[PDB]
Amino acid sequence: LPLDPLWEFPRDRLVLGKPLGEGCFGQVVRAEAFGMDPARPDQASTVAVKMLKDNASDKDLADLVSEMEVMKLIGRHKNIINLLGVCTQEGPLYVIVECAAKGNLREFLRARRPPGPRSSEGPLSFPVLVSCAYQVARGMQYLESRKCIHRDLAARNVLVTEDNVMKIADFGLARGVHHIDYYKKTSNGRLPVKWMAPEALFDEVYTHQSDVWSFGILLWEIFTLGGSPYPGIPVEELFSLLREGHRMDRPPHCPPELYGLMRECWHAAPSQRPTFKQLVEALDKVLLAV
Ligand SMILES: *CCC(=O)Nc1ccccc1Nc1ncc2c(n1)N(CCCN1CCN(C(=O)CC)CC1)C(=O)N(c1cc(OC)cc(OC)c1)C2
Protein backbone atom coordinates (compact mmCIF):
# COMPACT_ATOMS: atom_id res chain seq x y z
CA LEU A 1 0.00 0.00 0.00
CA PRO A 2 1.19 3.52 -0.87
CA LEU A 3 1.99 6.08 1.82
CA ASP A 4 -0.59 8.88 2.00
CA PRO A 5 0.85 11.45 4.46
CA LEU A 6 -2.42 13.35 4.70
CA TRP A 7 -4.07 10.36 6.39
CA GLU A 8 -1.28 8.18 7.80
CA PHE A 9 -1.25 7.82 11.61
CA PRO A 10 1.50 6.07 13.66
CA ARG A 11 0.08 2.72 14.80
CA ASP A 12 2.05 2.98 18.03
CA ARG A 13 -0.11 6.00 18.97
CA LEU A 14 -3.02 3.58 19.14
CA VAL A 15 -3.94 1.39 22.10
CA LEU A 16 -6.51 -1.19 21.02
CA GLY A 17 -9.39 -1.88 23.41
CA LYS A 18 -12.78 -3.60 23.44
CA PRO A 19 -14.26 -5.09 20.27
CA LEU A 20 -17.49 -3.50 19.06
CA GLY A 21 -18.57 -6.21 16.59
CA GLU A 22 -17.94 -7.77 13.16
CA GLY A 23 -19.41 -8.86 9.82
CA CYS A 24 -17.76 -5.90 8.11
CA PHE A 25 -15.33 -8.27 6.23
CA GLY A 26 -13.08 -7.35 9.18
CA GLN A 27 -13.83 -6.11 12.66
CA VAL A 28 -14.23 -2.91 14.65
CA VAL A 29 -12.45 -2.18 17.91
CA ARG A 30 -12.64 0.70 20.39
CA ALA A 31 -9.24 2.36 20.86
CA GLU A 32 -7.50 5.30 22.44
CA ALA A 33 -5.41 7.52 20.18
CA PHE A 34 -2.69 9.89 21.34
CA GLY A 35 -2.16 13.08 19.37
CA MET A 36 -4.95 12.60 16.85
CA ASP A 37 -4.91 16.39 17.00
CA PRO A 38 -1.22 17.15 16.26
CA ALA A 39 -1.44 20.44 18.18
CA ARG A 40 -1.74 18.25 21.28
CA PRO A 41 0.53 15.22 20.72
CA ASP A 42 0.04 13.62 24.15
CA GLN A 43 -3.73 14.05 24.48
CA ALA A 44 -5.91 10.94 24.42
CA SER A 45 -9.13 10.48 22.47
CA THR A 46 -11.48 7.56 21.98
CA VAL A 47 -11.76 6.26 18.43
CA ALA A 48 -12.96 3.21 16.49
CA VAL A 49 -10.54 1.18 14.41
CA LYS A 50 -11.58 -1.17 11.63
CA MET A 51 -9.26 -4.07 10.75
CA LEU A 52 -9.26 -7.48 9.01
CA LYS A 53 -10.17 -10.81 10.59
CA ASP A 54 -7.05 -12.74 11.60
CA ASN A 55 -7.99 -15.39 9.05
CA ALA A 56 -9.00 -13.00 6.28
CA SER A 57 -7.77 -13.34 2.70
CA ASP A 58 -7.10 -11.05 -0.26
CA LYS A 59 -10.78 -10.43 -1.00
CA ASP A 60 -11.41 -9.02 2.48
CA LEU A 61 -8.31 -6.83 2.18
CA ALA A 62 -9.31 -5.39 -1.21
CA ASP A 63 -12.68 -4.49 0.30
CA LEU A 64 -11.16 -2.79 3.34
CA VAL A 65 -8.76 -0.80 1.15
CA SER A 66 -11.76 0.12 -1.02
CA GLU A 67 -13.88 1.39 1.90
CA MET A 68 -10.84 3.32 3.14
CA GLU A 69 -10.39 5.04 -0.21
CA VAL A 70 -14.11 5.82 -0.37
CA MET A 71 -14.02 7.50 3.02
CA LYS A 72 -10.97 9.52 1.98
CA LEU A 73 -13.00 10.84 -0.94
CA ILE A 74 -16.36 11.64 0.60
CA GLY A 75 -14.72 14.09 3.01
CA ARG A 76 -16.00 15.35 6.34
CA HIS A 77 -19.53 16.09 7.60
CA LYS A 78 -21.22 16.47 10.99
CA ASN A 79 -23.81 13.78 10.25
CA ILE A 80 -21.62 10.95 8.96
CA ILE A 81 -18.98 8.80 10.61
CA ASN A 82 -15.77 10.57 9.59
CA LEU A 83 -12.39 9.12 8.67
CA LEU A 84 -9.68 10.21 11.14
CA GLY A 85 -6.60 8.34 9.91
CA VAL A 86 -5.18 5.08 8.57
CA CYS A 87 -2.32 2.70 9.35
CA THR A 88 -1.04 1.17 6.13
CA GLN A 89 2.72 0.95 6.66
CA GLU A 90 4.80 -1.69 8.48
CA GLY A 91 1.94 -3.65 10.01
CA PRO A 92 -1.71 -4.64 9.57
CA LEU A 93 -4.20 -2.32 7.89
CA TYR A 94 -6.09 -0.09 10.33
CA VAL A 95 -8.84 2.35 9.39
CA ILE A 96 -9.44 4.89 12.13
CA VAL A 97 -12.82 6.58 12.40
CA GLU A 98 -14.95 8.54 14.91
CA CYS A 99 -16.42 6.65 17.85
CA ALA A 100 -20.02 7.50 18.76
CA ALA A 101 -20.65 7.19 22.48
CA LYS A 102 -24.30 6.07 22.47
CA GLY A 103 -24.26 3.21 19.93
CA ASN A 104 -26.72 2.80 17.06
CA LEU A 105 -30.02 4.68 16.71
CA ARG A 106 -32.22 1.60 16.89
CA GLU A 107 -30.89 0.56 20.29
CA PHE A 108 -30.75 4.22 21.38
CA LEU A 109 -34.49 4.52 20.74
CA ARG A 110 -35.54 1.12 22.09
CA ALA A 111 -33.75 1.73 25.38
CA ARG A 112 -35.65 5.02 25.74
CA ARG A 113 -39.23 3.85 25.32
CA PRO A 114 -41.56 5.70 27.78
CA PRO A 115 -43.43 4.27 30.80
CA GLY A 116 -46.37 2.17 29.62
CA PRO A 117 -44.24 15.40 38.43
CA ARG A 118 -42.48 13.96 35.36
CA SER A 119 -43.91 10.49 35.91
CA SER A 120 -45.12 10.12 32.30
CA GLU A 121 -42.36 12.19 30.72
CA GLY A 122 -40.03 9.78 28.92
CA PRO A 123 -36.54 10.69 27.67
CA LEU A 124 -37.63 11.10 24.03
CA SER A 125 -39.70 14.08 22.89
CA PHE A 126 -41.27 14.82 19.49
CA PRO A 127 -38.85 17.66 18.58
CA VAL A 128 -35.80 15.47 19.34
CA LEU A 129 -37.26 12.63 17.24
CA VAL A 130 -37.77 15.05 14.34
CA SER A 131 -34.23 16.35 14.91
CA CYS A 132 -32.93 12.79 14.60
CA ALA A 133 -34.66 12.41 11.24
CA TYR A 134 -33.61 15.87 10.09
CA GLN A 135 -29.97 15.08 10.87
CA VAL A 136 -30.05 11.76 9.01
CA ALA A 137 -31.55 13.56 6.01
CA ARG A 138 -28.81 16.22 6.20
CA GLY A 139 -26.09 13.55 6.17
CA MET A 140 -27.72 11.69 3.30
CA GLN A 141 -27.93 14.94 1.38
CA TYR A 142 -24.21 15.38 1.95
CA LEU A 143 -23.52 11.79 0.91
CA GLU A 144 -25.62 12.32 -2.23
CA SER A 145 -23.65 15.49 -3.11
CA ARG A 146 -20.51 13.31 -2.92
CA LYS A 147 -21.92 10.71 -5.37
CA CYS A 148 -22.41 8.12 -2.62
CA ILE A 149 -25.38 5.74 -2.67
CA HIS A 150 -25.65 4.09 0.73
CA ARG A 151 -27.65 0.96 -0.30
CA ASP A 152 -28.49 -0.13 3.27
CA LEU A 153 -29.81 2.93 5.10
CA ALA A 154 -31.40 1.78 8.36
CA ALA A 155 -31.56 2.93 11.99
CA ARG A 156 -28.97 0.27 12.88
CA ASN A 157 -26.60 2.02 10.46
CA VAL A 158 -27.00 5.35 12.21
CA LEU A 159 -24.72 6.00 15.18
CA VAL A 160 -25.44 8.41 18.04
CA THR A 161 -22.81 10.65 19.68
CA GLU A 162 -22.71 11.85 23.28
CA ASP A 163 -24.43 15.08 22.17
CA ASN A 164 -27.12 13.07 20.32
CA VAL A 165 -25.75 13.92 16.89
CA MET A 166 -26.75 11.33 14.26
CA LYS A 167 -23.87 9.85 12.27
CA ILE A 168 -24.55 7.69 9.22
CA ALA A 169 -22.35 4.61 9.18
CA ASP A 170 -21.37 1.89 6.72
CA PHE A 171 -21.82 3.92 3.54
CA GLY A 172 -18.54 2.84 1.95
CA LEU A 173 -19.16 -0.92 1.88
CA ALA A 174 -19.40 -3.41 -0.97
CA ARG A 175 -22.91 -4.80 -0.57
CA GLY A 176 -22.82 -7.74 -2.96
CA VAL A 177 -25.81 -6.40 -4.87
CA HIS A 178 -26.11 -9.46 -7.12
CA HIS A 179 -26.10 -12.20 -4.44
CA ILE A 180 -28.29 -11.08 -1.56
CA ASP A 181 -30.06 -13.88 0.33
CA TYR A 182 -33.34 -12.07 0.97
CA TYR A 183 -34.35 -14.69 3.57
CA LYS A 184 -31.21 -14.59 5.74
CA LYS A 185 -31.11 -12.67 9.01
CA THR A 186 -27.88 -10.79 9.72
CA SER A 187 -26.00 -10.41 12.93
CA ASN A 188 -29.03 -8.79 14.65
CA GLY A 189 -31.67 -11.11 13.32
CA ARG A 190 -32.20 -8.17 11.01
CA LEU A 191 -33.59 -8.68 7.50
CA PRO A 192 -32.13 -5.93 5.27
CA VAL A 193 -34.62 -6.78 2.51
CA LYS A 194 -37.20 -4.79 4.51
CA TRP A 195 -35.25 -1.61 3.71
CA MET A 196 -34.82 -2.24 -0.04
CA ALA A 197 -36.55 -0.05 -2.60
CA PRO A 198 -38.72 -1.96 -5.12
CA GLU A 199 -36.27 -1.13 -7.97
CA ALA A 200 -33.31 -2.57 -5.98
CA LEU A 201 -35.27 -5.56 -4.80
CA PHE A 202 -36.95 -6.53 -8.07
CA ASP A 203 -34.62 -4.99 -10.66
CA GLU A 204 -31.28 -4.74 -8.78
CA VAL A 205 -31.29 -0.98 -9.52
CA TYR A 206 -29.79 1.44 -6.98
CA THR A 207 -30.03 5.22 -7.13
CA HIS A 208 -30.15 8.04 -4.60
CA GLN A 209 -33.93 7.71 -4.85
CA SER A 210 -33.55 4.09 -3.71
CA ASP A 211 -31.98 5.53 -0.55
CA VAL A 212 -34.98 7.89 -0.11
CA TRP A 213 -37.22 4.82 0.13
CA SER A 214 -34.92 3.46 2.82
CA PHE A 215 -35.07 6.81 4.61
CA GLY A 216 -38.86 6.48 4.79
CA ILE A 217 -38.46 3.08 6.45
CA LEU A 218 -35.93 4.71 8.79
CA LEU A 219 -38.53 7.43 9.50
CA TRP A 220 -40.97 4.70 10.51
CA GLU A 221 -38.35 3.17 12.83
CA ILE A 222 -37.80 6.52 14.52
CA PHE A 223 -41.46 7.18 15.27
CA THR A 224 -42.10 3.64 16.48
CA LEU A 225 -39.07 4.25 18.73
CA GLY A 226 -36.99 1.49 17.14
CA GLY A 227 -39.74 -0.82 15.87
CA SER A 228 -39.25 -3.61 13.32
CA PRO A 229 -40.56 -2.74 9.84
CA TYR A 230 -43.44 -4.82 8.48
CA PRO A 231 -44.08 -6.20 12.00
CA GLY A 232 -44.72 -9.95 12.03
CA ILE A 233 -44.53 -10.28 8.25
CA PRO A 234 -42.35 -13.10 6.85
CA VAL A 235 -40.16 -12.24 3.82
CA GLU A 236 -42.31 -14.46 1.55
CA GLU A 237 -45.36 -12.33 2.30
CA LEU A 238 -43.32 -9.11 1.95
CA PHE A 239 -42.63 -9.97 -1.71
CA SER A 240 -46.38 -10.32 -2.37
CA LEU A 241 -47.39 -7.22 -0.42
CA LEU A 242 -44.88 -5.12 -2.34
CA ARG A 243 -46.08 -6.46 -5.70
CA GLU A 244 -49.61 -5.57 -4.58
CA GLY A 245 -48.47 -2.03 -3.71
CA HIS A 246 -49.11 -2.37 0.00
CA ARG A 247 -47.37 -0.11 2.54
CA MET A 248 -46.93 0.00 6.33
CA ASP A 249 -49.72 1.51 8.46
CA ARG A 250 -49.43 4.85 10.21
CA PRO A 251 -47.78 4.19 13.60
CA PRO A 252 -49.43 5.18 16.91
CA HIS A 253 -48.50 8.60 18.30
CA CYS A 254 -47.27 9.77 14.89
CA PRO A 255 -48.49 13.03 13.33
CA PRO A 256 -50.02 12.91 9.83
CA GLU A 257 -47.30 15.23 8.50
CA LEU A 258 -44.69 12.55 9.15
CA TYR A 259 -46.71 9.57 7.97
CA GLY A 260 -47.36 11.71 4.90
CA LEU A 261 -43.60 12.01 4.39
CA MET A 262 -43.13 8.25 4.83
CA ARG A 263 -45.72 7.53 2.16
CA GLU A 264 -44.10 9.95 -0.28
CA CYS A 265 -40.75 8.18 0.27
CA TRP A 266 -42.47 4.86 -0.56
CA HIS A 267 -43.97 6.02 -3.87
CA ALA A 268 -43.48 3.13 -6.30
CA ALA A 269 -41.79 5.38 -8.84
CA PRO A 270 -38.40 6.73 -7.71
CA SER A 271 -39.04 9.88 -9.73
CA GLN A 272 -42.11 10.58 -7.60
CA ARG A 273 -40.33 10.33 -4.24
CA PRO A 274 -38.92 13.46 -2.56
CA THR A 275 -35.24 14.29 -2.97
CA PHE A 276 -33.10 14.50 0.19
CA LYS A 277 -32.99 18.28 -0.27
CA GLN A 278 -36.79 18.33 -0.13
CA LEU A 279 -36.82 15.99 2.86
CA VAL A 280 -34.32 18.25 4.62
CA GLU A 281 -36.51 21.32 3.99
CA ALA A 282 -39.75 19.58 4.93
CA LEU A 283 -38.28 18.25 8.18
CA ASP A 284 -36.63 21.60 8.92
CA LYS A 285 -40.00 23.36 8.67
CA VAL A 286 -41.42 20.84 11.13
CA LEU A 287 -38.45 21.39 13.41
CA LEU A 288 -39.10 25.13 13.14
CA ALA A 289 -42.76 24.76 14.09
CA VAL A 290 -42.00 22.77 17.24
C1 LIG B 1 -17.10 5.21 21.19
C2 LIG B 1 -17.63 4.49 22.38
C3 LIG B 1 -18.18 3.12 22.06
O1 LIG B 1 -17.67 2.09 22.47
N1 LIG B 1 -19.25 3.14 21.23
C4 LIG B 1 -20.02 2.03 20.80
C5 LIG B 1 -20.35 0.95 21.66
C6 LIG B 1 -21.11 -0.10 21.19
C7 LIG B 1 -21.57 -0.11 19.88
C8 LIG B 1 -21.27 0.94 19.03
C9 LIG B 1 -20.51 2.03 19.49
N2 LIG B 1 -20.17 3.08 18.67
C10 LIG B 1 -19.56 3.10 17.47
N3 LIG B 1 -18.92 4.25 17.21
C11 LIG B 1 -18.27 4.34 16.06
C12 LIG B 1 -18.29 3.22 15.13
C13 LIG B 1 -19.00 2.07 15.49
N4 LIG B 1 -19.64 2.02 16.66
N5 LIG B 1 -19.10 0.99 14.63
C14 LIG B 1 -20.07 -0.11 14.90
C15 LIG B 1 -19.54 -1.21 15.79
C16 LIG B 1 -20.62 -2.20 16.20
N6 LIG B 1 -21.00 -3.20 15.19
C17 LIG B 1 -19.87 -3.53 14.31
C18 LIG B 1 -20.25 -4.63 13.35
N7 LIG B 1 -21.43 -4.25 12.57
C19 LIG B 1 -21.50 -4.28 11.23
O2 LIG B 1 -22.55 -4.51 10.64
C20 LIG B 1 -20.23 -4.05 10.45
C21 LIG B 1 -19.75 -2.62 10.57
C22 LIG B 1 -22.55 -3.84 13.41
C23 LIG B 1 -22.12 -2.74 14.35
C24 LIG B 1 -18.40 0.97 13.44
O3 LIG B 1 -18.39 -0.05 12.77
N8 LIG B 1 -17.82 2.14 13.00
C25 LIG B 1 -17.46 2.30 11.63
C26 LIG B 1 -18.32 2.97 10.78
C27 LIG B 1 -17.97 3.19 9.46
O4 LIG B 1 -18.86 3.85 8.65
C28 LIG B 1 -18.43 4.18 7.33
C29 LIG B 1 -16.74 2.75 8.98
C30 LIG B 1 -15.87 2.11 9.84
O5 LIG B 1 -14.65 1.68 9.37
C31 LIG B 1 -14.29 2.03 8.04
C32 LIG B 1 -16.22 1.88 11.17
C33 LIG B 1 -17.59 3.31 13.82
Author numbering: 454 to 569, 577 to 750
What do the authors report?
In this study, we designed and synthesized the first dual-warhead covalent FGFR4 inhibitor (CXF-009) targeting two cysteines in the FGFR4 ATP-binding pocket. CXF-008 and CXF-009 possess two arms that can both reach cysteine residues located in the P-loop and hinge regions of FGFR4. Based on the mass shift in the mass spectrometry, CXF-009 forms covalent bonds with FGFR4(C477A) and FGFR4(C552A), respectively. No mass shift was observed in the mass spectrometry after FGFR4(C477A, C552A) incubation with CXF-009.
Upon binding to FGFs via the extracellular domain, FGFRs dimerize and trigger protein phosphorylation to activate the Ras-mitogen-activated protein kinase (MAPK) pathway and protein kinase B (AKT) pathways.
